[PDB]
Amino acid sequence: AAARGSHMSVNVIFGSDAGATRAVASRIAKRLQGRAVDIKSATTTDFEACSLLILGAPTYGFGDLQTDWETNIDKLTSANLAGKKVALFGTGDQTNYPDSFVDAMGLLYDHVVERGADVVGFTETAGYDYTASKAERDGRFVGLALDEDGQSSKTEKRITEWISRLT
Amino acid sequence: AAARGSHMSVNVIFGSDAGATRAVASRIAKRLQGRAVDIKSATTTDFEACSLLILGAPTYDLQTDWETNIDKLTSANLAGKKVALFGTGVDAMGLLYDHVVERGADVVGFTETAGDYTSKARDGRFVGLALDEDGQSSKTEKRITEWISRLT
Numbered sequence: 001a002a003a004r005g006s007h008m009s010v011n012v013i014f015g016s017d018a019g020a021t022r023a024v025a026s027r028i029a030k031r032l033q034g035r036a037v038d039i040k041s042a043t044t045t046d047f048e049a050c051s052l053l054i055l056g057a058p059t060y061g062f063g064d065l066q067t068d069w070e071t072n073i074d075k076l077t078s079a080n081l082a083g084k085k086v087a088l089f090g091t092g093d094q095t096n097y098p099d100s101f102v103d104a105m106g107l108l109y110d111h112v113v114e115r116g117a118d119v120v121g122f123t124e125t126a127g128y129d130y131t132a133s134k135a136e137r138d139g140r141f142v143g144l145a146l147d148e149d150g151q152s153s154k155t156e157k158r159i160t161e162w163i164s165r166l167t
Numbered sequence: 168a169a170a171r172g173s174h175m176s177v178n179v180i181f182g183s184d185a186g187a188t189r190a191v192a193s194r195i196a197k198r199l200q201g202r203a204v205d206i207k208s209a210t211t212t213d214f215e216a217c218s219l220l221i222l223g224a225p226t227y228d229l230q231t232d233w234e235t236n237i238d239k240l241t242s243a244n245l246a247g248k249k250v251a252l253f254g255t256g257v258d259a260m261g262l263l264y265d266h267v268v269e270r271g272a273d274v275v276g277f278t279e280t281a282g283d284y285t286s287k288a289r290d291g292r293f294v295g296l297a298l299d300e301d302g303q304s305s306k307t308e309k310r311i312t313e314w315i316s317r318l319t
């Protein structure tokens with residue numbers, strides 16, 4: 001008999017190569033009493049069997065999704081998300097990639113919207129120095145944008161204010 | 168935020184006409200820290216989002232609610248999943264047993280035939296917890312305790 005993993009019906013599905021997005025996912029999962037699930041081992045049940053789904057991904061390659069998200073994208077595109085509450089967060093580097101800042105979060109946004117999800121947790125782009133971002137929609141990010149490389153001093157406040165808006 | 172419903176990853180999906188299987192499924196769920204879900208309102212998520220799935224059914228043949236909603240079973244991925252069965256009463260437990268082994272499930276929780284009948288539920292033993300709330304009601308608490316010990 002294995003535990004469900006958390007008390008609340010919140011699944012935080014993440015990808016990570018160097019551990020930065022993985023640690024942020026655990027921080028989000030703790031405050032929402034949810035499960036942190038790596039997209040490498042995630043199933044479509046992890047996408048479907050939750051009242052609040054949160055997807056997080058860093059941007060790698062050439063403005064692409066993290067490789068595990070790219071490979072396992074079928075688990076998302078085959079998941080029933082119509083009318084389901086979904087939030088997103090992205091890790092990025094606006095100093096070294098100002099023209100592809102947290103683009104992976106924008107790519108996740110197009111996927112969940114394609115599956116009919118109701119996305120919440122839009123944030124503002126005010127305190128960011130970047131030229132282009134696929135996560136930007138009319139002066140707003142489609143989710144929580146974090147920069148653990150050149151702006152990690154603001155991550156705690158950004159997560160704190162973002163979390164309280166998802167409940 | 169919505170609670171998942173239980174601490175342990177155990178889903179007890181049952182059918183009931185007169186409330187006997189419903190009280191048993193609720194008791195089994197409380198002992199195993201699981202959720203009890205009626206097949207009438209169960210979803211495919213209820214069948215797949217658990218490490219231990221438990222199916223209960225009365226015999227009337229398979230209870231009509233299970234038959235009408237049997238697609239929730241046949242359309243769920245149970246390959247390699249731990250599934251146990253209980254039956255109130257012959258037994259529709261065997262008809263449900265044939266459904267889950269088709270889906271590639273790993274059935275656990277077999278019981279012995281100790282303690283009067285002439286039963287589709289194999290190889291000299293029961294495919295699950297056989298219960299009789301019409302004459303052996305007081306013993307049910309014991310057979311559940313032994314059944315839970317075999318699952319934990």
Ligand SMILES: Cc1cc2nc3c(=O)[nH]c(=O)nc-3n(C[C@H](O)[C@H](O)[C@H](O)COP(=O)(O)O)c2cc1C
Pocket residue numbers: 015016017018019020021022058059060061062063064091092093094097100101102103148149
């Ligand atoms: C090869 C490479 C390409 C990157 N491309 C981008 C990019 O296009 N946009 C961005 O915002 N960050 C980009 N980054 C920064 C990472 O997304 C950032 O460091 C992130 O926090 C890494 O998360 P992880 O440690 O969980 O893998 C890139 C990093 C590397 C190494």
Ligand SMILES: Cc1cc2nc3c(=O)[nH]c(=O)nc-3n(C[C@H](O)[C@H](O)[C@H](O)COP(=O)(O)O)c2cc1C
Pocket residue numbers: 182183184185186187188189225226227228255256257258300301
């Ligand atoms: C019309 C009818 C037929 C039944 N047929 C069987 C049967 O074939 N085998 C059996 O073990 N019990 C049989 N029973 C007993 C019920 O399965 C038993 O009372 C059960 O606990 C009822 O569950 P429920 O109250 O949740 O509907 C039958 C009961 C009725 C009323």
